[PDB]
Amino acid sequence: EGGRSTTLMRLPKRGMQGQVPGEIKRPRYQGVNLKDLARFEGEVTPELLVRAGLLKKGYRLKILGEGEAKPLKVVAHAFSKSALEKLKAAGGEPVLLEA
Amino acid sequence: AHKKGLGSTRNGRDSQAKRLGVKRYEGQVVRAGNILVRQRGTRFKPGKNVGMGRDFTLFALVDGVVEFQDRGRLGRYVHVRPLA
């Protein structure tokens, strides 16, 4: 560029760039497909997932994604519809938590 | 130094080139939508399997081959016989 208007002829879409106090302390959820979850057994839970090789401090746990659900209990903050289905083949659903 | 007053003009403005003309010649395979001809008036009438746009813009609507046809005082055409 130099002189003429650069591809800045574009246009902020990103509706919402932020007020002045800043970002709003909101709870973030990180998905983790049961696919990976089927790497170990027992009773998988957050922390045990971060310490593993996924998630890590990224807040609330949300299992889902593809992969074949393994017959065992899985504790999460959320579960996807089709994930909850997959745990049909004998699994768990200790949702909610956070108390 | 001689630079006596220099006259002036005006009629020094033109229009943008529109790149009109036939975009696909007979024998060429074309998919539906391919805008064959792109004239201004009706230089080329729409033939079988052909569509005319706002600007007489001829466009094929059938996946097949192309081909023209002179009908004399009936005006030329350009139908896209289907790959049957």
């Binding site: 574009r10 246009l11 902020p12 879409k13 990103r14 | -």
Partner: protein
């Protein structure tokens, strides 16, 4: 020192999974008064090329 994220970019482009750069079509901000629905309708994001290569270089750190 630590390169800086161009916020003017960070505000008009969402960088995709394959690496492509995406932004909203230009036109319908006020132009109008009477444009075909087709025109005013046909405005919902798009590609860019050789130029986004440049874009991506300004969005460094925020990957």
């Amino acid at each position: 020192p630590k390169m800086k994220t161009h916020k003017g970019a960070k505000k008009r482009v969402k960088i995709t999974a394959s690496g492509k750069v995406v932004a909203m079509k230009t036109g319908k901000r006020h132009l109008n008064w009477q444009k075909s629905g087709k025109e005013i309708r046909q405005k919902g994001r798009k590609f860019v090329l050789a130029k986004p290569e440049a874009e991506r270089i300004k969005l460094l750190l925020p990957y």
